[PDB]
């Protein structure tokens, strides 16, 4: 299915995923895409941090659903 | 100074702070409002996540800026 990845500066990806995919898993698709390295990557849904070994449908995350993505660099 | 602090679910507060506040300093002053633990919150401003030990001036964060609040909970 497809997803929506939005940053908060206004970039928008579409991804190619599945619903039991991983946090992890999608991260891995981010880089794979943009070349973002996953340990960067904080991906957001509900209003909250979402967890690398939960699935797209623990979170009820389904087809078109957009999540946000912010950046952590130290 | 003023800043507002909203969270990705249309929640929106204002806050008194300093430039030289440290992003931990204003994680305590949420944590004041709104009784959330400063280790269950992530600030964002400009697309990047925030770092703790770093202050509102070293990002250039100005009066009346807004801060997104993202939370940070196991299992949820």
Same mark, same amino acid.
């Given at each position: 299915?497809? %997803?929506?990845?939005? @940053?908060? @500066?206004?970039? *928008? %990806? #579409? ?6 995919? *991983? %946090? $992890?898993?999608?991260? !891995?698709?981010?880089?794979?895409? $943009?070349? /973002? ?6 991906? /957001?849904? !509900?209003?909250?941090? =979402?967890?690398?070994? +939960? #699935? ?7 087809? $078109?659903? @957009?999540?946000? =993505?912010? =950046? +952590?660099? +130290?």
């Amino acid at each position: 299915m497809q %997803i929506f990845v939005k @940053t908060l @500066t206004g970039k *928008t %990806i #579409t991804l190619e995923v599945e619903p039991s995919d *991983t %946090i $992890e898993n999608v991260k !891995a698709k981010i880089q794979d895409k $943009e070349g /973002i390295p996953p340990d960067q990557q904080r991906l /957001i849904w !509900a209003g909250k941090q =979402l967890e690398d070994g +939960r #699935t797209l449908s623990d979170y009820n995350i389904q087809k $078109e659903s @957009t999540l946000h =993505l912010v =950046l +952590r660099l +130290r």
